[PDB]
């Protein structure tokens with residue numbers, strides 16, 4: 407939330423990086439570093455806090471009631487045949503793949519019907535995605 | 542939220558980077574660094590806070606009621622055949638792929654019907670996406 | 677939440693990295709480092725806090741009631757045959773794969789119907805994804 411970074415190869419504060427086939431002969435490197443850091447991140451100062459939720463019923467006549475959740479799946483048909491016919495023939499399959507519904511990252515918070523919150527919520531995702539690499 | 546960065550290859554504060562086939566002969570590098578940092582990020586100052594939610598019923602007559610969630614899927618048909626017929630023939634498949642519904646990043650917060658919030662919510666996603674690389 | 681980083685290869689504070697075939701002959705490296713760090717992360721200061729939830733019924737007549745959860749799956753059919761017919765033929769399959777529903781990361785918090793929160797919730801995911809690599 408404060409210092410989120412994505413670094414590809416190299417990350418450094420003071421780097422005298424050297425690489426292939428070099429001559430580092432008579433250098434006189436000298437440093438003088440002062441790097442004081444002060445974090446006072448999201449400190450609270452609270453006197454009172456109330457989360458109230460009341461449901462009062464009475465003399466109440468209620469018929470059919472349906473409150474369904476935050477994702478319903480109904481009558482979902484996946485209908486993928488795969489028919490191969492081959493008479494006196496030559497076939498060559500490489501990097502052949504058939505994928506159906508598939509997920510890599512699935513993150514859910516506060517997936518309800520009724521919710522009362524107080525706080526600080528984060529979701530951070532850092533990757534190097536590579537699905538198909540055939541060659 | 543404050544210092545979000547995406548770095549491709551190299552990230553540094555003071556970098557005397559050297560690369561292929563060089564002559565670093567009589568240099569007299571000298572540094573003098575003062576890098577004081579003060580973070581007071583989202584500090585609160587609160588005397589009172591109330592999250593009130595009331596539902597009062599009474600002498601109330603209610604018929605059919607339906608409150609459905611924040612994503613419904615109904616009668617979704619995926620109908621992808623794949624028929625190959627080959628008589629006395631030559632076939633060559635490489636980097637051949639059939640993909641159906643597929644996700645990589647799925648993040649959800651506060652997916653409800655009724656919600657009362659108080660706070661600080663973030664979603665950060667940093668990647669290097671590469672779906673198909675065949676060659 | 678404060679210092680989240682994704683580093684590809686190298687991470688360092690002060691790195692005199694050297695690589696292939698080099699001459700590091702008469703250097704006079706010198707350092708002087710002061711790196712005081714002070715973290716006071718999310719310290720609270722609270723006098724009172726109440727999470728109240730009441731449900732009062734009485735003289736109440738209720739018919740059919742259905743409150744279903746935050747994800748229902750109903751009548752989901754996966755119908756993927758795979759028929760191969762081969763008379764007097766040559767077939768070659770390599771890196772051949774058929775995948776059905778599949779997940780790698782599944783994280784859920786506060787997946788309910790009714791929820792009252794107070795606090796600090798995080799989800800962090802860092803990876804190097806590589807699904808198919810055949811070659």
Ligand SMILES: *[C@@H]1O[C@H](CO)[C@@H](O)[C@H](O)[C@H]1NC(C)=O
Pocket residue numbers: 431432567702
């Ligand atoms: C630096 O090193 C070289 C070596 O080739 C030498 O000839 C030269 O006198 C040196 N000078 C100092 C100031 O160290």
Ligand SMILES: *[C@@H]1O[C@H](CO)[C@@H](O)[C@H](O)[C@H]1NC(C)=O
Pocket residue numbers: 438439440708
């Ligand atoms: C290096 O930094 C310190 C920190 O204040 C300072 O007192 C000093 O004069 C600087 N130089 C040297 C040569 O030490």
Ligand SMILES: *[C@@H]1O[C@H](CO)[C@@H](O)[C@H](O)[C@H]1NC(C)=O
Pocket residue numbers: 449450451452586721
């Ligand atoms: C608010 O400020 C600081 C905490 O950050 C503290 O010294 C002060 O007493 C707080 N005030 C109250 C009323 O709590």
Ligand SMILES: *[C@@H]1O[C@H](CO)[C@@H](O)[C@H](O)[C@H]1NC(C)=O
Pocket residue numbers: 469470605
């Ligand atoms: C709703 O309630 C009535 C009763 O008044 C009932 O006849 C009907 O079947 C209910 N609805 C469903 C979908 O069952």
Ligand SMILES: *[C@@H]1O[C@H](CO)[C@@H](O)[C@H](O)[C@H]1NC(C)=O
Pocket residue numbers: 432566567
């Ligand atoms: C720097 O190094 C070179 C080496 O080729 C030398 O001839 C020269 O006298 C040096 N000078 C100083 C100031 O160090």
Ligand SMILES: *[C@@H]1O[C@H](CO)[C@@H](O)[C@H](O)[C@H]1NC(C)=O
Pocket residue numbers: 438573574575
């Ligand atoms: C380096 O920085 C410090 C910090 O204030 C300063 O006192 C000093 O004069 C600077 N120069 C040297 C040569 O130390």
Ligand SMILES: *[C@@H]1O[C@H](CO)[C@@H](O)[C@H](O)[C@H]1NC(C)=O
Pocket residue numbers: 451584585586587
């Ligand atoms: C608000 O300001 C600071 C906290 O940031 C604190 O010193 C002060 O007392 C706070 N005021 C009240 C009324 O809490």
Ligand SMILES: *[C@@H]1O[C@H](CO)[C@@H](O)[C@H](O)[C@H]1NC(C)=O
Pocket residue numbers: 604605
């Ligand atoms: C709605 O309620 C009536 C009762 O008055 C019922 O006949 C009807 O079937 C209900 N609707 C559905 C879709 O069931």
Ligand SMILES: *[C@@H]1O[C@H](CO)[C@@H](O)[C@H](O)[C@H]1NC(C)=O
Pocket residue numbers: 432701702
């Ligand atoms: C540095 O090392 C070289 C070795 O080739 C030498 O000739 C030179 O006199 C040295 N100088 C110092 C200042 O150490």
Ligand SMILES: *[C@@H]1O[C@H](CO)[C@@H](O)[C@H](O)[C@H]1NC(C)=O
Pocket residue numbers: 708709710
């Ligand atoms: C190194 O840093 C310290 C820390 O303040 C300082 O007292 C000193 O003068 C600096 N230089 C040397 C040569 O020690």
Ligand SMILES: *[C@@H]1O[C@H](CO)[C@@H](O)[C@H](O)[C@H]1NC(C)=O
Pocket residue numbers: 451719720721722
């Ligand atoms: C709030 O500020 C600090 C804690 O961060 C503490 O010294 C002070 O007494 C706190 N105030 C109250 C009323 O608790």
Ligand SMILES: *[C@@H]1O[C@H](CO)[C@@H](O)[C@H](O)[C@H]1NC(C)=O
Pocket residue numbers: 470739740
């Ligand atoms: C709803 O309740 C009525 C009674 O009044 C009943 O006849 C009906 O079958 C119920 N609904 C379902 C779907 O069973």
